[PDB]
Each structure stands twice: as C-alpha cells, then as structure tokens.
Amino acid sequence: EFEHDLERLCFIGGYDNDNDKVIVVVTKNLELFKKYDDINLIKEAYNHVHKLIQKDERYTAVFFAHDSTVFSYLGLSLKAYYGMDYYLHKNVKAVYVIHTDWMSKVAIRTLLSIASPKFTRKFRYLNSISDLNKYIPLSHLKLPPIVYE
C-alpha cells in the first residue's frame, strides 16, 4: 500500500564479508510521498528502519544522492539520520554518500574534514617564513617576492 513505497527507499541491500548488514537509502525516492496527505512520514520512517536493524547489531549506511542537494532529500534524509537514537550512530561501521551535486559534495567533504582529526593535526602554525626553514629547507622552493616583504 503506502508501505509499498518505503521498501523502495530503504533496503538491506546485502551483507558485508564480516556478515553484518548494509542499509541502502535512496534520497531521491521521497516524492513518492507528496501524494498521500495526513502522513507524518518521519515517525513512520523511524518505525520502518527500527524493524530493519536489531539494537545491538552493527550495520553500514549507504546513501544515494543522485540529483539531490543539501536543501532537499539529502539535507532532510541526514537531519533525520541525526535525530535517531544514539545506538544507531554507535553501531555503524561507516556511512557512504554517493553521487550528489557539486555544492553538496564540497559541503559534505568540509564537515568530515572538520570531524576527521587525523587530518587536522598535520597542520603546524608558524609566525613567519623564517621558522619554516627548520622543516622544509628554503634552499629548494622558488617563491614570489611577496613572501619576503
């Protein structure tokens, strides 16, 4: 019925080689639901996905952007995904976003870069170019004169 449109938005597409679930979600198949009226759609989604993952069960999330932006179908899909209970966030092994537009791609990779700490450490802040010579020698390095003014 109505329910015969959710299992065109959230499957267990398969299982990893560690024999734990993968959960596929297509961010584009919500316009199926602008035609019903009266449905809350997010509690019903929460109910749906709850029946797909046991509570102490590790899984994997895969989203299909595919002509959705952060202002529609992906912004709403994830923001939903953040309001879930904590165990869903603790049990994921990884979450994969696939094939969105440029704005969403640069916006996504930005927040992971903030999140991923192993990357934010290779930074080292120097007061002037004089101090860089310790790490990268200035005997290499052709530079414009502006870095010496």
Next chain:
Amino acid sequence: GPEFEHDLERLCFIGGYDNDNDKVIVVVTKNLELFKKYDDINLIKEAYNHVHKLIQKDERYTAVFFAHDSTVFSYLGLSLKAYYGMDYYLHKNVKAVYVIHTDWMSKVAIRTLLSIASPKFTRKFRYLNSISDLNKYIPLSHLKLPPIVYE
C-alpha cells in the same frame, strides 16, 4: 582566459621538493585579489580543478600556506575553508600543512572548536563520486541495488 590560468598558477603552484623528492606545493593567500578583476566565473571550482592538475591521485606531498599580511582579511581562513572541502585523498596524502600567520589563533579558533564538538558519528562518513568507487570497501556482488544506478 589565459590570463586567468596564469593568475591561478600565481596563486597555487609547485614550490619545490624534499625527501623522498615529494612535491611541496605553495599557496599564497594574498593572491586572491588577482581574481577580483574578473566577472562571472566559479573560482573555487577551477581552483579545485587546478589543484587536481598539480598533484595526482596518490602522491605524498607537503602544503604551505603563506598568510603573513594583514588588513581587512588575510583569506587564510578562506583558502583553508576551500582546502577543507577538497577530495578526501588530498587530505590523506599530506605530509604536513605549514601555515605562515602570526596571530593565527584569531582565525582558526572557530574551526578548532567545531572539530572539538564534532561527534564520532560524522567521522565514519565518506563521500564517493559514483557507484563504482564503492567496490573497495563493500563488495557490490553481495548487494541488490535499485534501478536508479543502472541503465
């Protein structure tokens, strides 16, 4: 046109090498004024394109940001925000990111705190450009996939 691609090379270029003779690329932060002279163009896009040309898919390298000036913006925060939104590989293959600014804490304070408050949940994420790039982590033979990704 050509003056554009030349300004791009003046903004971000190859500085030199180290050991094991890996590229050390240099980005000058005072040098985004060269693009004010232009009208309609998506700078950040072609800047990503230019950096893609400068270093290939897997190549260890060091990055250096020159932000020692002052005034109404030094655009270190602007070039960093641009750097943070670049392809994941460009984040892994970095040896180090040296950043030449004196009062740098007055700039990276907001970012530092955003990293502090980022939950481990958002850390396990990863974007992939197309469906083919999944294969390494999860095998697709194991999965039934919708007609959207097919012909």
